[PDB]
Design a protein around this ligand. Structure first.
Ligand code: UDP
Ligand code: GAL
Ligand code: GAL
Ligand code: MN
Length: 293
């Protein structure tokens, strides 16, 4: 049950004036595409605070990637869901390496110890199993929504309740202007992740997705099961869990899509005029050095 909103004074939405004319702000299945200028965060904050919403944020910091946690968490404190209840879940093979970050009121952090796999591919792919294992009791009792992100990142601007919905993905910043045949979906029919050249709405990122706990448990269980079928068939998808996530979101359309505001790489892609804000961005790193002992 939802109580009434209070009286609020804010600018009138004008029907014959779009918020953004330069971008698609709604998918063909009527899911909002979240860009700056499309939402009044005061109305959304009211709606979600009246529900006492709790948001879980999952982040994996395995092996050398524990070095990214200090900046990730300190910037999360400045920018992620401030004013709302937040539960961080840090999955790591090194609990003693998790930095002591000071948190705002109504925010908590739990450290979940997990095993480390040797190959970066497996570390990244096995997040789906691990998230689904933890949905299956812990998340269901503790949070309303789960946001599942890469750790090699920092928040630079607001990331708030505008993203929350039963199921969301995020447009990969390398592909948002690309035609679908250029998307790097898995193209081998022998893989569970296979998408034909004439299918596909968007190219979503493996590094930022989420939803209600029920929908995120569905997605992560389905992706884990599909990866297991591929492993048994001796095939590993071209972009690993990202490829499986794209297949899942093609067949189970998300109820919001985040614009590339929400996962950008300024070093590789700069700051185009269509991005009014860069909210969550890649930390530069050396793949070969950071992924291997
Ligand atoms: O040795 C590793 C490799 C990967 N990851 C986790 O897997 C995510 C995806 O890997 P990565 O960020 O290397 O992929 P990229 O964004 O560089 O393509 C990382 O953010 C970490 O959460 C990890 O913790 N340790
Ligand atoms: O083509 C898909 C790939 O795009 C690259 O830019 C990115 O580094 C990869 O992680 C993967 O998403
Ligand atoms: O190579 C697979 C990786 O691709 C990246 O683009 C994505 O942000 C990571 O989360 C992981 O899915
Ligand atoms: Mn990453």
């Amino acid at each position: 049950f939802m109580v009434s909103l209070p009286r609020m004074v804010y600018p009138q939405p004008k029907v014959l004036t779009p918020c953004r004319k330069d971008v698609l702000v709604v998918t063909p299945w009527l899911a909002p595409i979240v860009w700056e200028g499309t939402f009044n965060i005061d109305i959304l904050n009211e709606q979600f605070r009246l529900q006492n919403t709790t948001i879980g944020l999952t982040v994996f910091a395995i092996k050398k990637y524990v070095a990214f946690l200090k900046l990730f968490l300190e910037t999360a404190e400045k920018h992620f869901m401030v004013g709302h209840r937040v539960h961080y879940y840090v999955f790591t093979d090194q609990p003693a390496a998790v930095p002591r970050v000071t948190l705002g009121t109504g925010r908590q952090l739990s450290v979940l110890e997990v095993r480390a796999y040797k190959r970066w591919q497996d570390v990244s792919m096995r997040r789906m199993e691990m998230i689904s294992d933890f949905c299956e009791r812990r998340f269901l009792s503790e949070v309303d929504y789960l946001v599942c992100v890469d750790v090699d990142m920092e928040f630079r601007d607001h990331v708030g309740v505008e993203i929350l919905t039963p199921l969301f993905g995020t447009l990969h910043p390398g592909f948002y202007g690309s035609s679908r045949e250029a998307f790097t979906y898995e193209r081998r029919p022998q893989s569970q992740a296979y998408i034909p050249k004439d299918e596909g709405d968007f190219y979503y990122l493996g590094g930022f997705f989420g939803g209600s706990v029920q929908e995120v448990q569905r997605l992560t269980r389905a992706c884990h099961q599909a990866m297991m079928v591929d492993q048994a068939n001796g095939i590993e998808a071209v972009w690993h869990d990202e490829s499986h996530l794209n297949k899942y979101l093609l067949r189970h359309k998300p109820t919001k899509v985040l614009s590339p505001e929400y996962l950008w790489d300024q070093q590789l892609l700069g700051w185009p005029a269509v991005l009014r804000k860069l909210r969550f961005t890649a930390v530069p790193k050396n793949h070969q050095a950071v992924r291997n002992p």
